[PDB]
Amino acid sequence: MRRHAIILAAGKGTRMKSKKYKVLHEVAGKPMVEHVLESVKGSGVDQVVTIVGHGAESVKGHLGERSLYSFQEEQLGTAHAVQMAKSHLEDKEGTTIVVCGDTPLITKETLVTLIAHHEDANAQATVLSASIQQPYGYGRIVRNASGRLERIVEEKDATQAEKDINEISSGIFAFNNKTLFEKLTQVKNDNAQGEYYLPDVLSLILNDGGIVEVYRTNDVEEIMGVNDRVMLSQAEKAMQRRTNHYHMLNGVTIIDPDSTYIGPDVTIGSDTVIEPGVRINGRTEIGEDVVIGQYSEINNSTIENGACIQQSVVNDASVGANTKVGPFAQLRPGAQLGADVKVGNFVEIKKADLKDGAKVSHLSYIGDAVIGERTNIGCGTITVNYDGENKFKTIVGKDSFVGCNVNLVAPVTIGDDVLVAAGSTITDDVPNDSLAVARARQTTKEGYRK
Amino acid sequence: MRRHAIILAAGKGTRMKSKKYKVLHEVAGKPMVEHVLESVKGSGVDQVVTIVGHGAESVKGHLGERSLYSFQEEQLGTAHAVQMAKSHLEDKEGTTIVVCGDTPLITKETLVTLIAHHEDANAQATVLSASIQQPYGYGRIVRNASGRLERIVEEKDATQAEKDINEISSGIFAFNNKTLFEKLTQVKNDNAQGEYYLPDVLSLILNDGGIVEVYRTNDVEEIMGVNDRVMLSQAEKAMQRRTNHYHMLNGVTIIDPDSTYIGPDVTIGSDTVIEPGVRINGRTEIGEDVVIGQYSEINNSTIENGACIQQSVVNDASVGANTKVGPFAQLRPGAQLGADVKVGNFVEIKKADLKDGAKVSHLSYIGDAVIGERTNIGCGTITVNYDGENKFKTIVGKDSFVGCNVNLVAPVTIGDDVLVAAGSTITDDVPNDSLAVARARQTTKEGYRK
Amino acid sequence: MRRHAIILAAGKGTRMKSKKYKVLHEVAGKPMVEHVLESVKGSGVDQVVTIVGHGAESVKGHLGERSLYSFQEEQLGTAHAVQMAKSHLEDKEGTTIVVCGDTPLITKETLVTLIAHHEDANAQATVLSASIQQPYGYGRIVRNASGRLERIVEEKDATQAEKDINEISSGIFAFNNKTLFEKLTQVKNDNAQGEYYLPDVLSLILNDGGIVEVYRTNDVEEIMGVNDRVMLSQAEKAMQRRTNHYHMLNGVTIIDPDSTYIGPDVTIGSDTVIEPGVRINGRTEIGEDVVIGQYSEINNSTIENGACIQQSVVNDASVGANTKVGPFAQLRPGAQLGADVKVGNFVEIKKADLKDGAKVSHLSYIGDAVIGERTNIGCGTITVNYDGENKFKTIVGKDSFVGCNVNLVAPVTIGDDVLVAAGSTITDDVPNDSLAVARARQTTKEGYRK
Ligand SMILES: O=c1ccn([C@@H]2O[C@H](COP(=O)(O)OP(=O)(O)OP(=O)(O)O)[C@@H](O)[C@H]2O)c(=O)[nH]1
Ligand SMILES: O=c1ccn([C@@H]2O[C@H](COP(=O)(O)OP(=O)(O)OP(=O)(O)O)[C@@H](O)[C@H]2O)c(=O)[nH]1
Ligand SMILES: O=c1ccn([C@@H]2O[C@H](COP(=O)(O)OP(=O)(O)OP(=O)(O)O)[C@@H](O)[C@H]2O)c(=O)[nH]1
Ligand SMILES: O=P(O)(O)O[C@H]1O[C@H](CO)[C@@H](O)[C@H](O)[C@H]1O
Ligand SMILES: O=P(O)(O)O[C@H]1O[C@H](CO)[C@@H](O)[C@H](O)[C@H]1O
Ligand SMILES: O=P(O)(O)O[C@H]1O[C@H](CO)[C@@H](O)[C@H](O)[C@H]1O
Ligand SMILES: [Mg+2]
């Protein structure tokens, strides 16, 4: 049977005190709604619909074609939001999970099991619950003698005995999709907020004698809903605790887990050392025996075995084995460093291929360029790749020596085994085994300052 | 009626184990005594006197003319210190608050209310109190049946019932100024330390049948007195907790509140994101939708809406809307960046005006200079502004292109729509719509290295 | 009497999930086994033997000649490991302590007292114990009526009354060396793990009527044994807490003790300020009144009174009084900065002597060089010290001015009171009081771009 998801992303977010949609605020460098989408899709869901409000271009921009979209004109409650998905899902069959876009810690494994538990019980609906130390204000799970849901009782309606229940509804549900949309027509908004509340469908299903199950997650933190900036930092800290503990149980040294931020899509090989203050996000793959040095930032990159990154910024880059970067270097998108390369302090690499053994040790910019194997780029050297309209390519051959403070005015090709003299501005191609020099000779005015 | 303050700043500070006056040690980048002065002045005080010891030039240097000064030759106690203010304040009328210079968390709102409570009761003296979980060693507030002060009882003198009192004297008082100086003459130093203790004036006022009130602050942390380096870090952490919570309740995202240090004079607009490790101090104004990136330091600066600062150092600078700075850039005093400017890695800007749209993308120094709108400054370019005696100005017009590794030898003016060729040292003014080139042509010695 | 130590460093370390020997993982930038060696040697030990396994070249590489080595072919337990030291120690007399290489917090003062307590009791063996809040699973110290050891009882063997004992064996022992090696011959491996357990020698000594003493350490954290990556971060945090508290009780300001990492071999003078995120390791000496600015890394260096280091990387360097470094500078090994020197942003110094008052303010590389007193090195200047085979020296005299973007092509000597014009490549020595210039003159093509 097919599986669908509705992600609720259209609320006003008044407690966030923001001009942006709440679900666009980030945890681990990604919007909350994108964490939710990743988990939903990872749970095996065939189709996702995201409920969006007015001016949702940013949300739709961010999820792209990974989700369908339904517009909620007025924010009249969670059940009304789910109703907006009718055009996409009313006549679908199978299981539909509903998840709020502000629940970024939800795991794909918990959703997989919620769905499997629902389908195997052939339930009409299944509520995801959790046990919490302080359940004040949450709907309490009241189970009947068979262990299925008797009702979710709100604080205001609970007897003193029911208030002692610690098992609470997370607000995340799985539904028989046909039943969901049939019961939504009967939900009323006869209450103080004037809102259509999604849990009301469960009481409609119960009053009709349908089966509502309960699946309890063992990780209460994963159902946390972020409503303000304090809760957003708590979600960053919960995610940090989760990922750091994962890597430390898998052979990664993390010197200071409180100050180290590793995103949920990062993989790290064993015997790697992450120093304090490091932030690693995006889809990053780090091999074994790597050192990521203090206060580095690494996004969407590949760092191979034995590499050393010291206090550097790395984006959309690849770093080969045993290569050394930094301190204070920047690898920009398309930087491709081979193995045994050196990129020293105050060096910027952009859209450039540094072949094995090449060295760019200091105070240089290498952009739109290929640097051949074992070539030494001197201090202060610049690929002049830009004319103000277009970009041009620089090619340097292997085993060459590019002197200090050299300007390579692209497009230009430097051969193999070439020496380019320090201080030269090179405009013409230089063949293999040549010396190129473009600088004035020295005039010494002796005694001029006597 | 007028209002005066005496700030006590002359103690030996033996427990600090310092060669500097205790009140000069810093919290949030400012001396403790300056935090106290700011609060006192913010409370509406007409005149401030600071009691200083020998070698106080540093204290007087720091507060300048915002305070009067009285010299305390020997450190004989708080009441003796207050006596040193006689020359300035003996014949003044009105309310006088006495605050120690080592109480940097004291808030101007608590002082405003201490003073108002004192004046509205027409009290002779009012003690600021607080409730503390562990009151051992502090003077306990013993109130009479009318709720006013009966006495402050020291631990050594208290009955077991009195020791159970959690309401303690903060050591901060408001006085009828004429009564204060009349009673100081009667305080004796007949005790083990040989010291004249300020609280003794309250018992003199009480024994004469005068009214002493009690105003209790709800924030016990604000009366903390720093006596050693451990307490100084506790005061930094208390101030951090206070300011971070303020900004997060006002629409600011702070990813890691434990590692983020925002001074008390910083204002931050909503939807701004402060990344981990950021330190913002001085009189700084940050607009809305700003990103301050990890491990940046920003002091005394203005950063407008939508700007992005990445791992950079910014001092006494202004950054316009949507401008991007860093990573690893430095803005020095007088740096003025317009809107939509780019300042890239390893760039230093000092006393320089970068007009809207200008770009300084890498490895450059711009000092004593004006860069016109949309002008592109190439990699490695330097305003040579210094001759070893004086500084000179560089002017670059709009829509110009300054090539890579160019030296602009000031004073020099570059016109509009100019191209300066890479590698050039420019000594003469360059008119609009011109090409300037100052470099040797290339000699290629083919086969030289065969 | 002589004193010996056996350090156990050959275990498989399976719970570390590592390809390296456990004792080689680091705390405060040093392998755990090196912390243990430092403490043992600091306790007065005449000879150290370290038990190593196969492929121990890295361990032997790291300790060098400060230890003897004995090879343990199969990991058959702590008593078997100690037996491997027979070749070095079997016929020695005196006291022998046995310490695991994974106990990096062990202090030399605790070992000194363990040994003195052992010798003064003329004991056969002495166990180092500690009191722990949760003793589950540890061997309990059961003392007899005279206060000496009756037995160490394992959890599995203890009565309920014995399980309530909080005093536990640390696994660190002192032995009469002749008795140790005589009893090791009788230890059997008749147990489930098939292992020879060192504590079994104590029960052999007891059954023969020998005296076994107990010395209790007051710091339970120092006997912590690191078995996994979580415990390794706990040991980093325990060491951080220990050193930070030490320096703060000795007149050092540490703004954020949770984010500041100071190694155990660092000395710091009073009134120094350590800002957040600073990491100081190796054998580092920092004088009084120093500021180490946020997110700096300093290793094996000397920083004298009043120096200021801002967000910089410093290795094997020396910095004189009142010298300013950074932000974003790098001092590499052999950098020697005199007093009142300035090293500004994006400057790299390697194997270079900067005499008093010299200034290297930005975007420069100084390597294999001497810069004389008060000499000003302009922005972009480079000592071209490398030809691709060898390194050459640059000498600059005093009170000279080296212009911006100058290349000094070593070997070259620049005299005193010299001006080198901006943009010059200098290949020939320049005498005192001279002007040197090596650059093309400017061609302005007016109207070229009209
Ligand atoms: O009408 C609604 C209400 C809520 N939602 C979505 O349901 C989830 C839970 O909704 P919340 O109650 O947590 O967020 P809110 O937008 O209502 O913020 P406040 O004003 O209460 O502070 C959120 O993700 C929200 O976007 C809708 O899509 N439509
Ligand atoms: O005689 C004094 C005593 C104290 N003070 C000021 O009163 C306030 C409280 O004085 P403290 O008792 O807290 O500081 P101290 O200087 O006496 O330091 P220790 O030797 O006790 O460690 C401090 O701010 C102090 O400067 C004086 O001005 N004069
Ligand atoms: O046979 C041994 C056992 C242990 N040791 C050394 O004794 C000390 C305590 O040994 P551990 O039990 O703590 O470490 P281990 O190597 O056995 O790691 P696990 O597989 O149990 O996870 C460690 O330092 C170890 O190196 C030996 O030298 N030889
Ligand atoms: O002496 P340094 O600074 O270590 O480095 C020197 O030799 C290196 C060899 O790899 C070169 O890459 C550098 O260009 C050069 O400055
Ligand atoms: O290719 P890059 O490194 O992104 O940047 C290039 O084009 C930019 C246009 O803004 C210029 O400012 C840079 O001088 C140039 O290097
Ligand atoms: O104006 P700035 O940037 O402060 O500094 C200027 O004068 C300094 C005097 O010390 C020189 O060292 C610098 O080379 C120069 O750029
Ligand atoms: Mg340069």
Tab-separated table of C-alpha atoms and ligand atoms in Angstrom, chain B residues 7-17 21-23 51-53 72 74-82 99-103 195-196 225-228, ligand 2:
chain	number	residue	atom	x	y	z
B	7	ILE	CA	31.280	54.656	43.939
B	8	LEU	CA	33.880	52.868	46.101
B	9	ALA	CA	36.908	52.023	43.943
B	10	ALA	CA	39.953	52.243	46.252
B	11	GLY	CA	40.213	48.871	47.989
B	12	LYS	CA	43.460	46.891	47.977
B	13	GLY	CA	41.809	43.946	46.183
B	14	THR	CA	44.110	41.418	47.863
B	15	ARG	CA	41.965	38.388	46.915
B	16	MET	CA	42.262	39.344	43.208
B	17	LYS	CA	46.040	38.669	43.368
B	21	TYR	CA	43.034	48.048	41.050
B	22	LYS	CA	40.277	45.462	41.345
B	23	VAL	CA	37.595	47.664	39.804
B	51	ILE	CA	36.722	57.098	45.785
B	52	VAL	CA	40.199	56.239	44.493
B	53	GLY	CA	43.500	55.206	46.068
B	72	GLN	CA	41.476	57.615	50.131
B	74	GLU	CA	44.642	54.373	53.690
B	75	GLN	CA	42.057	51.632	53.107
B	76	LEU	CA	40.276	51.827	56.458
B	77	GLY	CA	36.829	50.567	55.425
B	78	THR	CA	33.715	51.435	53.465
B	79	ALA	CA	32.526	54.117	55.881
B	80	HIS	CA	35.949	55.768	55.814
B	81	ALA	CA	35.912	55.605	51.997
B	82	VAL	CA	32.526	57.381	51.894
B	99	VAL	CA	27.718	51.427	45.421
B	100	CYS	CA	30.935	49.382	45.338
B	101	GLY	CA	32.928	49.482	42.123
B	102	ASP	CA	33.128	45.644	42.101
B	103	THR	CA	29.361	45.102	41.607
B	195	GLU	CA	37.761	49.278	60.022
B	196	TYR	CA	34.975	51.839	59.748
B	225	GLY	CA	30.524	41.472	44.368
B	226	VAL	CA	33.614	40.269	42.517
B	227	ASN	CA	36.556	39.528	44.829
B	228	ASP	CA	38.662	36.979	42.885
D	2	LIG	O1	38.798	50.838	52.378
D	2	LIG	C1	38.165	50.571	51.401
D	2	LIG	C2	37.615	49.333	51.290
D	2	LIG	C3	36.905	49.012	50.176
D	2	LIG	N1	36.757	49.888	49.185
D	2	LIG	C4	35.981	49.487	48.056
D	2	LIG	O2	34.657	48.799	48.634
D	2	LIG	C5	34.299	47.810	47.835
D	2	LIG	C6	34.163	46.533	48.653
D	2	LIG	O3	35.445	46.250	49.143
D	2	LIG	P1	35.993	44.706	49.080
D	2	LIG	O4	36.133	44.224	50.497
D	2	LIG	O5	35.057	43.790	48.310
D	2	LIG	O6	37.373	44.770	48.209
D	2	LIG	P2	38.866	44.918	48.839
D	2	LIG	O7	39.607	45.961	48.071
D	2	LIG	O8	38.829	45.247	50.316
D	2	LIG	O9	39.556	43.481	48.514
D	2	LIG	P3	40.119	42.422	49.617
D	2	LIG	O10	41.457	42.946	50.091
D	2	LIG	O11	39.131	42.291	50.749
D	2	LIG	O12	40.248	41.112	48.858
D	2	LIG	C7	35.450	47.641	46.781
D	2	LIG	O13	35.043	48.100	45.573
D	2	LIG	C8	36.581	48.507	47.314
D	2	LIG	O14	37.341	49.047	46.163
D	2	LIG	C9	37.299	51.140	49.300
D	2	LIG	O15	37.155	51.962	48.433
D	2	LIG	N2	38.025	51.456	50.418
